[model samples]
Target: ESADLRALAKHLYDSYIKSFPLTKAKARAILTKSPFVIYDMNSLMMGEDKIKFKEVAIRIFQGCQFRSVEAVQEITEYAKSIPGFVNLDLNDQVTLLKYGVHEIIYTMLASLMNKDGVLISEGQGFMTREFLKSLRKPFGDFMEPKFEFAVKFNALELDDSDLAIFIAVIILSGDRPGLLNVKPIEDIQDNLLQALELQLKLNHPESSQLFAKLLQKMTDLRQIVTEHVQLLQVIKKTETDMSLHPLLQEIEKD
Candidate 1:
């Protein structure tokens, strides 16, 4: 990279620390993970040589010069798909999940992995393990335990097991008027709907797991629907004349 690009890269890195103050390992991960650096570059106010901005972001984040445009495109595609701001503070972000284009949770975790050395060393699993380090308090929110706990309701980002717990908590907290999800199909639909969050909803719905759970019960359900339809049709034809007045009394006697 040229001196100007190097300078831009340094500026981006400095601003990121000012904004997020990541640990040393995370700093290196950001350098290795391309999208995290690209997010930083996107935040930059550079006017001239702007094309070089993303090029440099990828280089610094990935720690390697770009070999082809395709590599850059791959990372950019992921960065652009994530929601702009998903804090629980913004209700609109939560509502937008009905038509989100990408996996926000996955991308955020990817960015985190890039910042921490775990992605480089251990790949995606780094996210689950790393969250264990600060599962409750992100952005130094843990500095004041009481304050953190007080506003814990504002938290986002959760591990797989944590996500399960979150779902269960929501389910238990509801005051629905009747028994809920007596079967896997109902439960899976609820989980899938909850999963849609202005990011994961778009493609996650098409996943085989969702389909298998929701529609696979069709074997039993299909027979029930068919039988109901047939019964209605037979009743309509046979009772059409007889129901005028209890067939004037013959049907009532029978």
Candidate 2:
């Protein structure tokens, strides 16, 4: 079966982990050049659009789809919200979230410190750093992660022969998900965590290689999750501001 984004992410990640010669510079370079890298295009803003920030937030998540540059102005609105997140340019937001905003920062630091000591170009590093910073406050905590990760093939769906190719993508780009990572399992949601655990358990040479890629992907996943959580928090905070107290209290009874 063909791999989905997740499987493809895992497969590439595995290759990155095992091949000692795979330099950080090489991997970092590959990811930025990918068509999948998210970008925002809008530049000029029209008069005080009321729903502007909300529009920006939606685009932030959707732009992750790759090559779809649409949410360039709403960033101003994002900065206006919340106790801490606000007033940022589109490029700044993307750079912060992907690079230093939180989990991405941790990953960048770890990748630098790897025994390999390989480093990405300043430009690539800057781009990723900006992506991470663009996110909200609670998520800003991702600057430090509690867990360390390893890459491994046991978690991917690729056959033994093709596993290397899959790992390479993950190490360079990020987990995109696919059939190779989720198929065979009845449900990916129910199985992903379990499969991740299994990958963690194996010590085989092939497994070791795959594990390295997984560690990197874990960073990406963590960043993604943090962004979602922050967004939810923002939504909740918004409801409170507009006095959704009645709506919340009603639900509390159920």
Candidate 3:
């Protein structure tokens, strides 16, 4: 029903593809595969000893670690392109990406996911929910929540157009700490919310309550990241070989 919002949605769609390209059913995908690791699901189930359960759980995180660096770069490119995002005070821009990138990544993860697991290393390896839940201590606790969120999120069955506006809403958020100019972000967020509602209406004809459900998912995401940030703090202290990249450290910390 409009031009600029529609235009904005397309801008975001292109930006999204910069990170996650849509793929054919050649068994599904994510981008930029890492050659170093593989989950070896068959061996994992057969109770093989080549890599222990705890070790493979740790390895999966490392796989995610590699992609996260790529995720940050693509997220940076997309967030800066958001309308009015680049015009913000530098601190505000930094703050927004810091809080927002993980949330964007979490949502983006759903697109690569199904009920059982998410695709990693461009779908070259799949991490099952059962495997993640079987990890010892904080690792098990850390991963289980995302799979829950992902399963519910994937059920929404949103197209790229809907996802684009959803991601923009995350970027222009007004509540992030240390934002220099809150009203500008709020204004932009308001417009995107309008676009999001309209776009959902056009695309999702299933439920009258779909828009509210989507927003509720955003709130749930906040909870997920709140737990995530806390868990990473614990991981950094206790895991001895945590090997977090500075950018990853910054995102989880701030």
Candidate 4:
């Protein structure tokens, strides 16, 4: 039964990642020009550069919004597909997703980051570390740290099955700020964690601390995401003309 649960979760994760497939080769072929071309250092500056930059900002934000929505939807669908997950109250399901989707999105994003700190999106394509830094103020600042964390996290060298289990652990967390009934969720989380630990022990026998280290990674993921939210808040306040999607705004409220 323990192994069965892990198998099911791994299957879900595999499907989720493939849901909106984006390969480096395909993405590169499709993205003829860099999304940040307007701000390229060698480019001639237009007299209305600020206006162009704002438009670029809007494009980037919209891309992020679309990716975020797809991620949230994938998670929701995956959770519902699980046998016992949808058995939980609908409100509980919503609460879990609200607080947890961003973390999961970043976790998924971690797989896409290379050691050089570029983020690859399924549909939107690549954003380089330098190109991201060129964006106005806090917009670029928020993404770099996530890339940094991802590079280190990827170094641990866990396989897809392990990553799937870890994502399951993240989604089932009982400690989110507003869960209505913590005990049930906590029970599910504890069971998942135990299953993960057993799998890790068998898979990584030489690494005594892999399980503990993964827990620490989860802690760092939360901290990094908190900073992400803070930066988004600043964007909302500082960039008045920049519009956010209603779904993203709702996620921010959570």
Candidate 5:
């Protein structure tokens, strides 16, 4: 269960650092040092004062699209950095990115999340969980579920290097749909999983069974992503005004 974890983490960390807007030195400082300030999404939303949910939802959808398109590039870069990733069939590479990128984005989101709320838009502000729930279906239903996952994930206290390897495990997982070449993907996943386990154990010697707990988190993330895919479908079906990025459109087309 040994790996050159520092090297592996460094390979991806170069891309990971730039992908996020706020520097975590600042982010961690902000999260720990400052008192909580929960922005009220209901009373003070972006744009119009009394913007309807539909309008906001459209904006949210568009915002997510832009954010995810950027994240997709990050995930793709990270995926390609894996030792075995490029050797897989091109379709499988694309499929893995399609399914795995969501989890990657969600996990990265946890880095900004705290018990109070997640930081938004390059550290522009924090939004309260309470405010997210107040926005109704598209906002609350879509975002609220992720809050719990992010909260639990942040508890792991992963640093940049550990997170880098962990993300590889998420992408190379065998269970993703339409993976034409499963064994190689699974093999790659297994290696990263072990590396991640070793990394976690080395970082956290006292915690009981932390490695298994991280694996369990991966399963939990899948469920969260499944629920999100359902929401994406609803958005696609009903929200004609919202235009999705083509990559996102392709990714979820199961």
Candidate 6:
């Protein structure tokens, strides 16, 4: 049964990978070498193109927010396809998604980071370190930890199958703030953990601790999401001229 489960996981992963243009790692590597530059914020703020630059920056943020919403939707639907996910109550499903979606999004984002940092929505562009830092107070500060964790996490080089199952595990987490059927959810996650461990054993013979290390990445993801929320608050306060899409704003409220 476990072997069958792993096979299903592989099929799902292959299908999911096809939908994405690049893995997080591939996108980040491309961003690293790409010539896109984030000139100093002051450069934009004072220049003749200041209004244009601000518009561009806001547009970029909107793009990112849109990407995040799409990712959350994708992952949520994917979760429903997992073996036992739909068996849960509708409220449980909503609660799980409410808390877990951001973590999953950031976890996936972490996979996309390289030595340079994570890329923005469109190809051939990056949210450069200098430029991100120049954003208002918490906006710049929020991304550093995500980049730090992402670069280290990407070093593991886990494949799409691993990522798919790991994301399932994260979604099935029983410890979210208000879960009604903790035991059932934990049981589901336990099965996912077993499946992930088995695949890691088969695919990565040398990395005995890979499973444990991947668990730690979830912890990192939670922290990153929390920081991301704080950063969103700062953006709300500072970037009043710009507005988040209703869906993006809704997700942030959760």
- Model 5, position 22, has a per-residue lDDT of 54
TM-score of each: 0.18, 0.25, 0.84, 0.80, 0.84, 0.82
Off by over 4 Å in 4: 1-53, 119-124
What RMSD does model 3 have? 4.5
On the 0 to 100 scale, the lDDT of residue 136 in model 5 is 50
Question: By lDDT, is 2 or 3 better?
Answer: 3
Of the two candidates 1 and 5, the one with more favorable TM-score, higher being better, is: 5
Model 4 reaches what TM-score against the true structure? 0.80
Question: For model 1, what is the error of residue 249's alpha carbon versus the real structure, in angstroms, after optimal superposition?
Answer: 73
Tens-place lDDT digits, model 6, residues 79-137: 77777789998889887888888887777887656666556544444456556555555
Clashes of 3: 0
Per-residue lDDT tens digits for candidate 2, residues 1-254, read 22343463364344334432323454445543431222222321321131222444333333231111111112122222211122333333333323222332233234332221212322232223333344554333232231222122123323322323322222222122222222222232223333333434442445554545555565555655455445545656753432223322231221
**For residues 1-254, what per-residue lDDT tens digits would candidate 5 score against the true structure?**
14475566566667556554554555777776343354564444552332322465566546656877877886787677788899999999988888888888888877877777776555555666776666656656677778889888878777876777788888897898888989988988887777777778878888778888877898778888889889888877766666678888888776
Show model 3 residue runs off by greater than 4 Å: 22-54
Q: What TM-score does model 2 achieve against the real structure?
A: 0.25
- What digit string (tens of lDDT, one per residue) describes model 4 on residues 89-137? 7788888888888888887677666654444444333456666666666
Models sorted by TM-score, best on top:
3, 5, 6, 4, 2, 1
TM-score of model 5 relative to the true fold? 0.84
Summarize candidate 1's per-residue lDDT along 21-138 as a digit string, tens digits.
Answer: 2333453344443421112323223312332322332223222112112222332332222222222223332222211211222222223342222232212122222222332222
All candidates: CA RMSD (Å): 26.4, 16.3, 4.5, 5.1, 3.8, 4.0
* Model 2 error, position 215 (Å): 10
lDDT of 6: 0.72
